[PDB]
Amino acid sequence: ASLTEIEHLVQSVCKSYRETCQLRLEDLLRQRSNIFSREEVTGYQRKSMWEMWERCAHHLTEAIQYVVEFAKRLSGFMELCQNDQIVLLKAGAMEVVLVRMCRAYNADNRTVFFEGKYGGMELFRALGCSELISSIFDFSHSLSALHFSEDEIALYTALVLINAHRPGLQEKRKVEQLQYNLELAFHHHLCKTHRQSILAKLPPKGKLRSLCSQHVERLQIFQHLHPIVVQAAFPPLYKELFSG
């Protein structure tokens, strides 16, 4: 690939991302002072474990649906065989959502935009997965500190998805070429914008994997305690990706 071509790829990834945002960044910033009251937080804590799990699984599924659309719009993804597309989305959808989540995280007061307002991690207490929640908050805090631009999130999440090391890929060399092209697009944009200082500050290899594994582990405990709730009221796409 050449310079005009690499920049054409930068523009394309950024457009694909902006078109597949569930939440507008400006809407998330303008909602910062709309914080849940102590009474509303208490209301969330009083909810049953199953009710809170179902609400969160549904919100995650909705976020995953936008990630599926991002993949479909991503240059080179629809050219890969259906097996590889499914492999990349099954391993990467949740990882992309985890990165996208830093935009809904306010690092000034440690709050997240959830169901119309901002609330602290105490909001999720009824889930019974405090370690997982605090880790996702800490991860969101770490990305927020980097001051990620929308274009940086677009390029970085395109690379979270197009990972040639995913077990099960049939056309591995084809995914490797698409990955190298997106890596150049990413690194060229950081170089052009004087943002190469962030490379060393980006999450370590295995961190996104660790969060996804913990999510799957906590879902398996929850499923063991409430199997009918999962079977009857969890979204079909969520069960397909995380249950089995």
Partner: peptide, 10 residues
């Protein structure tokens, strides 16, 4: 089932 359907939907 679901993922296949989302990818085929044009």
């Amino acid at each position: 089932k679901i993922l296949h359907r989302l990818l085929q939907d044009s």
